[PDB]
Design an enzyme around this catalytic site. Structure first.
Site, PDB file in Angstrom:
ATOM      1  N   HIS A  31       0.854  -1.185   0.000  1.00  0.00           N
ATOM      2  CA  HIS A  31       0.000   0.000   0.000  1.00  0.00           C
ATOM      3  C   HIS A  31       0.908   1.260   0.000  1.00  0.00           C
ATOM      4  O   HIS A  31       0.698   2.204  -0.774  1.00  0.00           O
ATOM      5  CB  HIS A  31      -0.925  -0.042   1.238  1.00  0.00           C
ATOM      6  CG  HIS A  31      -1.804   1.176   1.411  1.00  0.00           C
ATOM      7  ND1 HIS A  31      -3.178   1.151   1.268  1.00  0.00           N
ATOM      8  CD2 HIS A  31      -1.493   2.447   1.767  1.00  0.00           C
ATOM      9  CE1 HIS A  31      -3.667   2.359   1.512  1.00  0.00           C
ATOM     10  NE2 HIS A  31      -2.661   3.170   1.792  1.00  0.00           N
ATOM     11  N   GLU A  32       1.912   1.274   0.864  1.00  0.00           N
ATOM     12  CA  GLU A  32       2.783   2.457   0.969  1.00  0.00           C
ATOM     13  C   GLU A  32       3.626   2.655  -0.290  1.00  0.00           C
ATOM     14  O   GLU A  32       3.708   3.763  -0.804  1.00  0.00           O
ATOM     15  CB  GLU A  32       3.670   2.399   2.194  1.00  0.00           C
ATOM     16  CG  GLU A  32       2.941   2.190   3.526  1.00  0.00           C
ATOM     17  CD  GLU A  32       1.768   3.117   3.768  1.00  0.00           C
ATOM     18  OE1 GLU A  32       1.773   4.236   3.268  1.00  0.00           O
ATOM     19  OE2 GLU A  32       0.813   2.697   4.459  1.00  0.00           O
TER      20      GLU A  32
ATOM     21  N   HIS B 294       1.700   4.193  -3.096  1.00  0.00           N
ATOM     22  CA  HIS B 294       1.549   5.643  -3.062  1.00  0.00           C
ATOM     23  C   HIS B 294       2.673   6.319  -3.888  1.00  0.00           C
ATOM     24  O   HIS B 294       2.432   7.298  -4.597  1.00  0.00           O
ATOM     25  CB  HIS B 294       1.558   6.174  -1.626  1.00  0.00           C
ATOM     26  CG  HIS B 294       0.235   6.081  -0.917  1.00  0.00           C
ATOM     27  ND1 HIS B 294      -0.929   6.596  -1.450  1.00  0.00           N
ATOM     28  CD2 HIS B 294      -0.107   5.562   0.290  1.00  0.00           C
ATOM     29  CE1 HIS B 294      -1.930   6.390  -0.608  1.00  0.00           C
ATOM     30  NE2 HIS B 294      -1.457   5.778   0.463  1.00  0.00           N
TER      31      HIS B 294
ATOM     32  N   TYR C 242      -4.315  14.308  -3.093  1.00  0.00           N
ATOM     33  CA  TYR C 242      -4.745  13.549  -1.901  1.00  0.00           C
ATOM     34  C   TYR C 242      -5.900  14.203  -1.145  1.00  0.00           C
ATOM     35  O   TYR C 242      -5.808  14.491   0.051  1.00  0.00           O
ATOM     36  CB  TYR C 242      -3.557  13.289  -0.980  1.00  0.00           C
ATOM     37  CG  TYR C 242      -3.695  12.105  -0.065  1.00  0.00           C
ATOM     38  CD1 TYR C 242      -3.791  10.831  -0.585  1.00  0.00           C
ATOM     39  CD2 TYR C 242      -3.690  12.259   1.320  1.00  0.00           C
ATOM     40  CE1 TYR C 242      -3.872   9.729   0.240  1.00  0.00           C
ATOM     41  CE2 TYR C 242      -3.787  11.164   2.158  1.00  0.00           C
ATOM     42  CZ  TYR C 242      -3.867   9.900   1.617  1.00  0.00           C
ATOM     43  OH  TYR C 242      -3.964   8.808   2.464  1.00  0.00           O
TER      44      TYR C 242
ATOM     45  N   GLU D 195      -6.168   6.335  -2.618  1.00  0.00           N
ATOM     46  CA  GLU D 195      -6.243   5.343  -1.551  1.00  0.00           C
ATOM     47  C   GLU D 195      -6.658   3.960  -2.058  1.00  0.00           C
ATOM     48  O   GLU D 195      -6.053   2.958  -1.679  1.00  0.00           O
ATOM     49  CB  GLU D 195      -7.216   5.809  -0.468  1.00  0.00           C
ATOM     50  CG  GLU D 195      -6.533   6.607   0.617  1.00  0.00           C
ATOM     51  CD  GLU D 195      -5.406   5.809   1.258  1.00  0.00           C
ATOM     52  OE1 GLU D 195      -5.656   4.670   1.682  1.00  0.00           O
ATOM     53  OE2 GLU D 195      -4.280   6.313   1.299  1.00  0.00           O
TER      54      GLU D 195
ATOM     55  N   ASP E   1     -10.441  13.592   7.325  1.00  0.00           N
ATOM     56  CA  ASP E   1      -9.698  12.616   6.537  1.00  0.00           C
ATOM     57  C   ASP E   1      -9.485  13.106   5.098  1.00  0.00           C
ATOM     58  O   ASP E   1      -9.624  12.351   4.144  1.00  0.00           O
ATOM     59  CB  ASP E   1     -10.445  11.265   6.570  1.00  0.00           C
ATOM     60  CG  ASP E   1      -9.696  10.138   5.882  1.00  0.00           C
ATOM     61  OD1 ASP E   1      -8.437  10.079   5.919  1.00  0.00           O
ATOM     62  OD2 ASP E   1     -10.392   9.274   5.313  1.00  0.00           O
TER      63      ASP E   1
ATOM     64  N   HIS F 114      -9.856   7.789   2.973  1.00  0.00           N
ATOM     65  CA  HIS F 114      -9.833   6.399   3.439  1.00  0.00           C
ATOM     66  C   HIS F 114     -11.226   5.824   3.681  1.00  0.00           C
ATOM     67  O   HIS F 114     -11.370   4.679   4.100  1.00  0.00           O
ATOM     68  CB  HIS F 114      -9.057   6.251   4.761  1.00  0.00           C
ATOM     69  CG  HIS F 114      -7.614   6.625   4.668  1.00  0.00           C
ATOM     70  ND1 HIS F 114      -7.153   7.889   4.965  1.00  0.00           N
ATOM     71  CD2 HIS F 114      -6.520   5.896   4.350  1.00  0.00           C
ATOM     72  CE1 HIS F 114      -5.840   7.933   4.789  1.00  0.00           C
ATOM     73  NE2 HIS F 114      -5.436   6.734   4.413  1.00  0.00           N
TER      74      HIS F 114
END
Ligand SMILES: CC(C)C[C@H](NP(=O)(O)CNC(=O)OCc1ccccc1)C(=O)N[C@@H](Cc1ccccc1)C(=O)O
Ligand SMILES: [Ca+2]
Ligand SMILES: [Ca+2]
Ligand SMILES: [Ca+2]
Ligand SMILES: [Ca+2]
Ligand SMILES: [Zn+2]
Length: 316
Positions: free
Chosen positions: A142-143, A146, A157, A166, A226, A231
């Protein structure tokens, strides 16, 4: 650093033994020279200065409790590099074999992980909500995803573009988890979330509503928390991706599944050829339809299923 490539051995966050690629020069460093221009793992030493120190070990054995998050950040970065190279012919996050850097032991009791614009960063968790976050292969992927997004579509974002950003990270996090093929699922973060509670996760792609996230555009969040729900509203796209791969009937709309590999091909092409920094959900639908058309033909099942899936989640 300059040195000779070596192979160490250690234990990850969940207690599993694995080999890791290291570099020897006086110490053994978490520097894997076998992939691109290297994978480098750093110790942030419970502080927030980044990257910290390149991880050094006297004996090339990484079995201490303190070593475990580093072992997994390093190893799972390798798996994610391999996925992108072998499956999508992409060389690191920038497509030109950029060095991949990660820091672990970031801050104290830190229950998150992130890409800071230049590197991956992992907290250790507080031991209740999370254990060290690099223990999750879906989290690591996931990271790193990005970084891939930032170098390609560049999705801003916030709001819908941010929810797409996301979802792209959850989708490829999951596809990497399937690629490694150890307890794969369509849940996010289950290996490191709530050690005292079995069977839960941070998000679900198969049923986002299980954890309070929307599964239909009519339920989208439009407040300011958020970053405008990046998310939260990711659930709408995650659900569409799940349906494309696995099929199902959702609010009465039936989707014929086409499998994970084709899901990945369609979304990778959308991400790299069609999405832009300001794409919204409707534009993602159009990008995915065009991508499936390029790959499989306008009359294909694959195109039909992409349309069904976006219909099912209320995105036109
Ligand atoms: C896969 C999971 C484990 C980590 C994932 N982290 P992430 O999405 O990369 C965090 N994003 C983030 O910090 O963006 C802000 C930022 C922007 C630019 C530069 C640096 C930071 C996540 O879903 N984070 C969520 C859920 C979460 C996890 C842990 C604690 C609190 C909340 C969030 O930040 O909301
Ligand atoms: Ca050691
Ligand atoms: Ca799993
Ligand atoms: Ca998972
Ligand atoms: Ca749990
Ligand atoms: Zn994220």
């Amino acid at each position: 650093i300059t040195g000779t490539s070596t192979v160490g051995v250690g234990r990850g966050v969940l207690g599993d033994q694995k080999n890791i690629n290291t570099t020897y020069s006086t110490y053994y460093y978490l520097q894997d020279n076998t992939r691109g221009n290297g994978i480098f793992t750093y110790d942030a030493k419970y502080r927030t200065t980044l990257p910290g120190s390149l991880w050094a070990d006297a004996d090339n054995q990484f079995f201490a409790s303190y070593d475990a998050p580093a072992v997994d950040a390093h190893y799972y970065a390798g798996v994610t590099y391999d996925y992108y190279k072998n499956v999508h012919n992409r060389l690191s996050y920038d497509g030109n074999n950029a060095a991949i850097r990660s820091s672990v032991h970031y801050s104290q009791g830190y229950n998150n992980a992130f890409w800071n614009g230049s590197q991956m960063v992992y907290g250790d968790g507080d031991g209740q909500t999370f254990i060290p976050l690099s223990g999750g292969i879906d989290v690591v992927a996931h990271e790193l995803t990005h970084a891939v997004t930032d170098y390609t579509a560049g999705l801003i974002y916030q709001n819908e573009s941010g929810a797409i950003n996301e979802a792209i990270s959850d989708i490829f996090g999951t596809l990497v988890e399937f690629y490694a093929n150890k307890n794969p699922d369509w849940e996010i973060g289950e290996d490191v979330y709530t050690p005292g509670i079995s069977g839960d996760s941070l998000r679900s792609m198969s049923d986002p509503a299980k954890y309070g996230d929307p599964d239909h555009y009519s339920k989208r969040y439009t407040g300011t928390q958020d970053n405008g729900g990046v998310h939260i509203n990711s659930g709408i796209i995650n659900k569409a991706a799940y349906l494309i791969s696995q099929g199902g009937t959702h609010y009465g709309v039936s989707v014929v599944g086409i499998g994970r590999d084709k899901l990945g091909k369609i979304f990778y092409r959308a991400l790299t050829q069609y999405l832009t920094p300001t794409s919204n959900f409707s534009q993602l639908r159009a990008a995915a339809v065009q991508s499936a058309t390029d790959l499989y033909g306008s009359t294909s099942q694959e195109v039909a299923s992409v349309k069904q899936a976006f219909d099912a989640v209320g995105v036109k």
